[PDB]
Amino acid sequence: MLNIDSIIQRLLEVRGSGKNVQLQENEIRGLCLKSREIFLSQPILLELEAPLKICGDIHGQYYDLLRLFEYGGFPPESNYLFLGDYVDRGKQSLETICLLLAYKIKYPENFFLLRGNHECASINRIYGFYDECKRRYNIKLWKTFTDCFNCLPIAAIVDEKIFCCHGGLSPDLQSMEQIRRIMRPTDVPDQGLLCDLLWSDPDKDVLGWGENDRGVSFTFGAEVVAKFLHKHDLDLICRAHQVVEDGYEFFAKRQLVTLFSAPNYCGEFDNAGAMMSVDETLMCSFQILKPAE
Amino acid sequence: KKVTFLEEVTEYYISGDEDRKGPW
Ligand SMILES: [Mn+2]
C-alpha cells in the first residue's frame, strides 16, 4: 500500500507557500519500518564516494529543508549525506523526517542519513518531537520513530579522506573497526564512544580533552584533530551539532568544518544555514541560505 | 584525492517572515 512516489509528491506540494502535510499514520509507520530495514542492511560506518552534498542540523525546519533541495537539486540529481538532528526545536519535525526517510527508501545508495544526538528518545521526548507526534498522531507513532532512529548509521567516510559524524571525536576511538562493531538497534548511552560521536565539540582553548560545558561528553583541541587525521590518513573532519553564524565554520586550520543547516535557528538566532558540496576530486564549496530581515 | 576549498560562497535570501519556533 505504501506509495513512496505519492508520499513524496504530497510532501513536496507545499513548496512556494509553514503549512502542514498530513500523511496517514500507516504511511508514516511504513516509512519507519522500511527505512529501518535499509539502515540495517547497510554498514553502520558508511563508505561513500564523491560527488555528494552534505548538510548539518535541520531540527524540523521543514521549509528550510525544501529550500536546501531547491538549491542543491532534488534527489537523485545529487547524492546527499545528512549529519543528523532532523527533529526537535522546529515546527515541523514530522514532515522533515518523513521526506528524508522517503528519499532514503527511494534512493538507498544515493541518499544517506546519520544519527544525531536528537535522534535519541531521552532527548527528543523533551525537545519537541514527542509533543508533535502526540498532538498530530499518537504515542505509538513516536515509539515507532524511536525504533527506527535506533538503527541509523553513526559515521561516514567519503573517498577515504573525509570522516563525518554528528558531534565529534572520542578519546576512545583508536580504530574504525570500533565503530563497525557497534551493534544495532542501540540507544545512545550516557558516555563512551557512541555518545562522543554524537555529542563532543571542538574547542580552541583546550589542549587534549576537556569536560564539555553541555554536561555530556567532551571537548577536544586542534592537535587531537591533527593526530587523528594523520593516524587514519584522512584529510578532513566534517561534523554538525553547533549553530554557527555563517552556517559553516572551520577549525584547526580547516582540518575540521562544522556545518549547520537550520537558518534562523528556533527563531532565537540570526544564523544562516549552509550546505557543503564535495565534487569528484574532493573540492569542497559552500551554499548559504540567509533569512531576509 | 585531496580535499580543497572554493573561496567564493553562494548566498540566497529566503523567508524571514516565517514561524520557526515549536512548543516544548
Ligand atoms: Mn546536535
Residue numbers in the entry:
A (entry chain A): 6 to 22, 25 to 300
B (entry chain B): 639 to 662
Provide the authors' own sentences about this structure as they appear in the paper.
Reversible phosphorylation of the alpha subunit of translation initiation factor 2 (eIF2a) is pivotal to control of global rates of protein synthesis and to modulating mRNA-specific translation in eukaryotes. In animal cells, eIF2a phosphorylation is reversed by cellular phosphatase complexes consisting of a protein phosphatase 1 catalytic subunit (PP1) and a substrate-specific regulatory subunit. An RVxF motif, common to many PP1 binding proteins, is present in the conserved functional core of the PPP1R15 family members and their viral counterparts, and plays an important role in assembly of the active holophosphatase complex. Our studies reveal the essential role of a third cellular factor, G-actin, in endowing the complex with substrate specificity and provide the first glimpse at the structure of a ternary holophosphatase complex possessing such substrate specificity.
PPP1R15A and PPP1R15B both formed stable complexes with PP1 (both the PP1A and PP1G isoforms were tested) but crystals suited for structural determination only arose from complexes between human PPP1R15B and mouse PP1G. The PPP1R15B peptide could be traced from K639, immediately N-terminal of the RVxF motif (K640VtF in human PPP1R15B), through to W662. As expected, the side chains of V641 and F643 (of the RVxF motif) engage hydrophobic crevices on the backside of the catalytic subunit, an interaction common to PP1 regulatory subunits. From there PPP1R15B winds its way through the C-terminal groove to the front of the catalytic subunit. Along this path PPP1R15B Y650 occupies a position similar to spinophilin F459 and PNUTS F411 whereas PPP1R15B I652 occupies a position similar to spinophilin T461 and PNUTS F413, whose side chains engage the ϕϕ motif binding-site of PP1. The side chain of PPP1R15B R658 engages a deep pocket on the PP1 surface, occupying the same position as spinophilin R469 and PNUTS R420 and forming a conserved salt bridge with PP1G D71 in the ‘Arg site’, as predicted by Choy and colleagues. Despite their presence in the crystallized proteins, none of the residues C-terminal to W662 could be assigned in the density maps, suggesting that the C-terminal portion of PPP1R15's functional core is disordered in the binary complex. Interestingly both spinophilin and PNUTS also appear to disengage from the surface of PP1 at a similar position (D475 of spinophilin and N424 of PNUTS), suggesting that the C-terminal extension of these regulatory subunits evolved to engage component(s) missing from the binary complex. PP1G in these crystals conformed to previous structural determinations of PP1 isoforms (RMS: 0.19–0.29 Å over more than 240 Cα atoms), indicating that the binding of PPP1R15 did not change PP1's structure. Residues C-terminal to W662, which are not conserved in other regulatory subunits, are also not resolved in crystal structures of the PPP1R15B-PP1G binary complex.
